[PDB]
Design a protein around this ligand. Structure first.
Ligand code: MG
Ligand code: MG
Ligand code: MG
Ligand code: MG
Ligand code: MG
Ligand code: MG
Ligand code: MG
Ligand code: MG
Ligand code: MG
Ligand code: MG
Ligand code: MG
Ligand code: MG
Ligand code: MG
Ligand code: MG
Ligand code: MG
Ligand code: MG
Lengths: 113, 54, 121, 214, 117
RNA sequence: ACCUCGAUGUCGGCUCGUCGCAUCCUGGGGCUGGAGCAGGUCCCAAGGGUUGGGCUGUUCGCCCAUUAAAGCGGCACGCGAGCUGGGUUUAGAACGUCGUGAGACAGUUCGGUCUCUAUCCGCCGCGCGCGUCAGAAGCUUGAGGAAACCUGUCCCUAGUACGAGAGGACCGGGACGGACGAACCUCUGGUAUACCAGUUGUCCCACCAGGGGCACGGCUGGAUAGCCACGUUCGGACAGGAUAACCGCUGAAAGCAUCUAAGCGGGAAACCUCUUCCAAGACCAGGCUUCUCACCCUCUAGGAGGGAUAAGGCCCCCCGCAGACCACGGGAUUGAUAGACCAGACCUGGAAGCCUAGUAAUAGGUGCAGGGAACUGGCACUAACCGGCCGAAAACUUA
RNA sequence: AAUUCCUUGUCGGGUAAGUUCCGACCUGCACGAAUGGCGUAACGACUUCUCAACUGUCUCAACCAUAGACUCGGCGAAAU
RNA sequence: GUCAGGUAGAGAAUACUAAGGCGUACGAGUGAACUAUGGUUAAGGAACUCGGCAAAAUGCCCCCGUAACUUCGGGAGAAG
């Protein structure tokens, strides 16, 4: 019943598009580079989604310059303004941690055709 | 670790008196017309007859 | 969480491949050094014929760590390779070009040069 | 001056500030509290106010507590605490039968919560006082987690009363000071205390005005 | 089915499950069991879950019951005779009573039965 | 060599501390051959801290990074009925030397059993019995004790005071650091022996499918609950009183002088309050309230004894994040205390069956499906029972 | 040097740091040619250093199951 | 000293199993600390220790390819 729902719903965030681990997604994060509110794009694949209601989080993995970067964000965080899912993912596990050792052809994932 | 000296009679009995037992509480129950004492724990079973009464 | 006797790659064009942290600075006894922390290391392996060579003790800023690092907005950041950049005497990137990414935490102060040199974040 | 109220620790959650910063808070149900007694200098020798908390049916209440509540002129409750003020000029603000709620605290203020920490049972020294465990190899003869030495060879004789040894930790009164009250929801009489307060869930706690920053 | 939260009943692990299975089998077979207090306590929720599975039994539930019970005749009788007998009771089909202890080891003895009404 | 060779186990290292300042720093003050920073000397001050590595058993010592600091000593050169055996100081053997020799060399080298179920006191926690002049139930002042007392970087003052220049302030404020300790699971991670899914070997449920036992829970991907740190917050205070060193005010003895002989001030992380905890067994056994504030019998009414009761407590019982037992907390038919059932959040990944494409493994609709324990709200369906024990007033003196 | 007390003799290599290790210098307290002087291909549960992986040895400690410890029933010692 | 089944496996080791023999002689409960055997672990990866002491790491079948030295056999299952 989430006893604290009467306190979490007041700050909950709507317009959250449906997404699952393994689907390619790009997130827009607000940042301040010397008093300048800009929007940075982070594109990758959702490797996990820990359900915690308001504290629900999600991690995205991205390969850049031959280096992997895992960025975790709260779903209902206010620093985000857009979470666009580009292509769905056809996976079997719920937390794609095994992707921390694949490169290129091996790190690829199927899509819901 | 070994006993250095002999414990006195009083020092022994004061603690030996602690090694006692606690009598259990009883409850009156009517079975086969006769009244008998059975602890409250087995009171419920006494009604159904699952407690043998020598 | 880089600490004493910890090997970590170098992200620069100085030849040094991997360095070994000796002791953390900024405190009497600091156990770990996260992103944006300066440390002293020694080149354990470098490119033959480079500027620095094996045995030269230098200073390096801890960037692109492996363990998770929490932000002020609840987000978390973590890379897959413990790296660092050899800094100059007071504060400057020893070298001319960076290769791997850098954590935005470097933007604290006096690392604008490294932030601009890093082609990401 | 030193405001205070009783509440219950429901659980911890997160909130977001105006600058998009996460803040872990704890929900405290600072429900209505009834003022039963007022201890004055002439009566007792100190300035204090007795508050009640928690609902209870009139069947479970005891006859002495029932008579006390009747004499006070209010209904019975589960728990009863007392807040000691600093002067009669301050204690005169409270009256018998008064009802205090969460409105006594404003946003951004600092409070000092008091509760009863959880119980860990008979915990070893390493968990009680953070003792440093000995070597787990190189011949350790069953000394992996015991403290070992206890004092001087033959001079002290005793063991310096007060040494840190094994025992039952926790389950004692603790006070967490200077906690920022993030928000106060009046619709439900709830407070969002910045941080983690002692005590288990559904446990009684006493929130009071800060002392060092009040 | 809640974890015992401490040392298991029968020696080490991998044995409490078999013990509870055999106890539930004997219960569903005879209609009344006499065991140790903690054993009956651990069996109560197990037997209640098995009875709920039997009640809901239409398909895919016989498999869930067989993966825990091995006696085919016991499963068949639990599915047929009991069946909807508890279709009205919204839980609590196992009644537990305490009896006098036995000689030798003073182990609190309990008895479990299936409510009939 | 004064107890100790019918036994006091010897050096270092790990765990654990306790006490002194002849003080390494933090704090204050005097003189400086103190222009300022940075130094030299002395006095008071132990509340707190006093790092991580390489060599060598090592103590010690040298070196590498730092650090306001990497302090000196006592406690059987602290701590082996707490541990380690690296060496010293058994038995084996070798090197060089000593002696014609068995052998020896505070010279070296390889190796070489570390025993005991705590009797008493000491200590860390928890109960029983009784006392606080009737039985008790709530809320508390509190003597007297316990806990903490750390400290660095940058930014204004100010590139000003100072200083030829280089160089470069005290004081007063702001922001951010490392360590210790307390709380918590809210975020991130570690643990999950009745949770979900893949799978090798093997047997079994007649057989396919689907399942079960064993091989570390057979192995992994995970995994909600409690616990934990690697994770999140919070304490270090501000302020008040008297002081050490020191600086002083009016002032004679001794017409001047003098911090003193009569008095009056400032004065530090030292001292006491001030911050957290325990505490009326504090025997001066505390203080403010509330309930019960009334029934018999025997001894020969001096007082005592037994029996039965009110409030209250305890016993039996369902449980907790409370817990070794004990004890604590909630309930007990006027109840959601626990077990079951429903639903929610959450974990796991697409369950058994039917049908379809593929000779085949396999995939697709029935399907955010099937399964699940700690978190939550309802539901008396099951257990708290037609139930047992303790449990309340000599009296006298003054006002 | 299993041989050197002076000694942590001096130089070079190894680590940022080396009374350990390797080669050389020879000032042989007190090496030395069958109580053998110079090593060996392979080898050694003989001793030492370094090198890649690895891991809770450690930073730094944390939880899970077992036989005890803990409570109950029965039997029932000990050294001193 | 003699019988030597089956399934994977080179195998009389390893895991289960057919016939056969046993649960063997004190038991029931309790997440205390702690004693002893295993399992797990974010980052460093021997930095603990006199000393890689104990755990972990490579570990099976078929192939490419295997150095210095050497008495010419070997190193070698080198390594990868
Ligand atoms: Mg051991
Ligand atoms: Mg001793
Ligand atoms: Mg003697
Ligand atoms: Mg002094
Ligand atoms: Mg003080
Ligand atoms: Mg060391
Ligand atoms: Mg010899
Ligand atoms: Mg080394
Ligand atoms: Mg010779
Ligand atoms: Mg020879
Ligand atoms: Mg016994
Ligand atoms: Mg036998
Ligand atoms: Mg245990
Ligand atoms: Mg590890
Ligand atoms: Mg790892
Ligand atoms: Mg080994």
């Amino acid at each position: 019943m989430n006893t604290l729902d009467f306190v979490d719903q007041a700050s909950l965030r709507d317009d959250i598009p449906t997404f699952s681990p393994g689907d390619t997604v790009n997130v827009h994060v607000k940042v301040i580079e010397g008093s300048k509110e800009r929007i940075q794009v982070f594109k990758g694949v959702v490797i996990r989604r820990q359900g915690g209601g308001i504290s629900e989080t999600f991690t995205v993995r991205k390969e850049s310059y031959g280096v992997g970067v895992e960025r975790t964000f709260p779903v209902h965080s206010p620093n985000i303004d857009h979470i666009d899912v580009l292509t769905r993912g056809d996976v079997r596990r719920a937390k794609l941690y095994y992707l921390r050792e694949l490169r290129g052809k091996k790190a690829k994932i199927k899509e819901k055709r | 670790a070994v006993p250095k000296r002999r414990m006195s009679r009083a020092n022994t009995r004061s603690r030996r008196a602690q090694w006692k037992a606690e009598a259990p509480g009883l409850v009156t129950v009517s079975v086969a017309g006769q009244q008998r004492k059975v602890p409250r724990r087995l009171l419920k079973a006494a009604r159904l007859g699952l407690v043998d009464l020598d | 969480m880089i600490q004493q006797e910890s090997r970590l790659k170098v992200a620069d064009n100085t030849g040094a491949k991997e360095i070994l942290c000796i002791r953390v600075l900024g405190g009497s006894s600091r156990r770990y050094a996260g992103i944006g922390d300066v440390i002293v290391a020694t080149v354990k392996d470098a490119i033959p014929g480079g500027n620095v060579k094996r045995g030269d003790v230098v200073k390096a800023v801890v960037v692109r760590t492996v363990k998770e690092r929490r932000r002020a907005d609840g987000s978390y950041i973590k890379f897959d390779e413990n790296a660092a950049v050899i800094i100059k005497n007071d504060n400057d990137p020893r070298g001319t070009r960076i290769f791997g990414p850098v954590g935005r935490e470097l933007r604290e102060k006096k690392f604008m040069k490294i932030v601009s040199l890093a082609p990401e974040v | 001056a030193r405001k205070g109220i009783l509440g219950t620790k429901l659980g911890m959650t997160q909130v977001f500030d105006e600058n998009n910063k996460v803040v872990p808070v704890t929900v405290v149900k600072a429900g209505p509290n009834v003022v039963t007694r007022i201890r004055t200098t002439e009566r007792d020798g100190y300035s204090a106010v007795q508050l009640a908390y928690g609902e209870i049916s009139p069947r479970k209440v005891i006859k002495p507590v029932a008579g006390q509540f009747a004499a006070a002129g209010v209904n019975p409750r589960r728990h009863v605490a007392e807040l000691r003020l600093d002067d009669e000029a301050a204690v005169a603000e409270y009256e018998v039968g008064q009802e205090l709620t969460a409105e006594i605290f404003s946003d951004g203020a600092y409070v000092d919560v008091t509760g009863t920490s959880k119980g860990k049972g008979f915990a070893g020294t390493m968990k009680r006082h953070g003792f440093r465990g000995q070597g787990a190899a190189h011949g350790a003869q069953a000394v992996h987690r015991r403290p070992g030495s206890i004092g001087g060879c033959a001079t002290p004789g005793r063991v310096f009363k007060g040494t840190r040894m094994s025992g039952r930790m926790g389950n004692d009164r603790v006070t967490t000071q200077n906690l920022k009250v993030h928000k106060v929801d009046a619709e439900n009489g709830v407070l969002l205390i910045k941080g983690a307060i002692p005590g288990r869930n559904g446990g009684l706690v006493v929130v009071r005005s800060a002392i060092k920053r009040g | 089915p809640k974890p015992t939260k401490g040392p298991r009943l029968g020696g080490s692990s991998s044995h409490q499950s078999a013990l509870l299975a055999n106890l539930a089998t004997s219960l569903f077979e005879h209609g009344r069991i006499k065991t140790t207090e903690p054993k009956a306590r651990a069996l109560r929720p197990y037997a209640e879950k098995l009875i709920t599975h039997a009640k809901k039994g239409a398909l895919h539930n016989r498999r869930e019951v067989m993966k825990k019970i091995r006696d085919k005749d016991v499963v068949h009788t639990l599915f047929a005779e009991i069946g909807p007998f508890y279709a009205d009771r919204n839980g609590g089909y196992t009644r537990i009573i305490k009896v006098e202890n036995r000689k030798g080891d003073n182990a609190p003895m309990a008895v479990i039965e299936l409510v009939r009404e």
